[PDB]
């Protein structure tokens, strides 16, 4: 489920983002933003895997899916 993105993991992401205090409704909105981001990147990674006639989503399919959003990822 999306519930695995727990309350203190979003709190740690906001503490690294520089947020001092978090409202009690950020937690379900951040999961809804993360789910949209994954539904936009995994769709392209699955498209590259189905185009490569594979069944295993490699890390270069994820790098290409992030490259198609202007989010180039170095190290794979």
Partner 1 sequence: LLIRKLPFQRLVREIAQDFKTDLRFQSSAVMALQEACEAYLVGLFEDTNLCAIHAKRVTIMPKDIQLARRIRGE
Partner 2 sequence: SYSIYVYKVLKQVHPDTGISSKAMGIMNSFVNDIFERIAGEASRLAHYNKRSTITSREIQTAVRLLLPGELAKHAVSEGTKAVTKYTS
Partner 3 sequence: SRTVRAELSFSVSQVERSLREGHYAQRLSRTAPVYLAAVIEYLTAKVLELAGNEAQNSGERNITPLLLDMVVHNDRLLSTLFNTTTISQV
Determine the Cα–Cα distance for residues 13 and 5; give it in Å rounded to an integer.
Answer: 11
> Hey, which residues between 10 and 39 contact partner 1 (CB under 8 A)?
10, 12-14, 16-23, 25-26, 29-30, 33-39
Contact 41, 66 (CB under 8 A): yes
> Hey, which residues between 18 and 57 contact partner 2 (CB under 8 A)?
44, 47-48, 50-52
Using CB under 7 A, which of 17, 20, 72, 74 touches DNA?
A: 20
62 binds, among partner 1, DNA, partner 3, none (CB under 5 to 8 A by kind): partner 1
């Amino acid at each position: 489920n999306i519930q695995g993105i727990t309350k203190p993991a979003i709190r740690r992401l906001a503490r690294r983002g520089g947020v001092k205090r978090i409202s009690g409704l950020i937690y379900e909105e951040t999961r809804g933003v993360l789910k949209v981001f994954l539904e936009n990147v995994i769709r392209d990674a699955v498209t590259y895997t189905e185009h490569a006639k594979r069944k295993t989503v490699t890390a270069m399919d994820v790098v290409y899916a992030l490259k198609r959003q202007g989010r180039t990822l170095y190290g794979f």
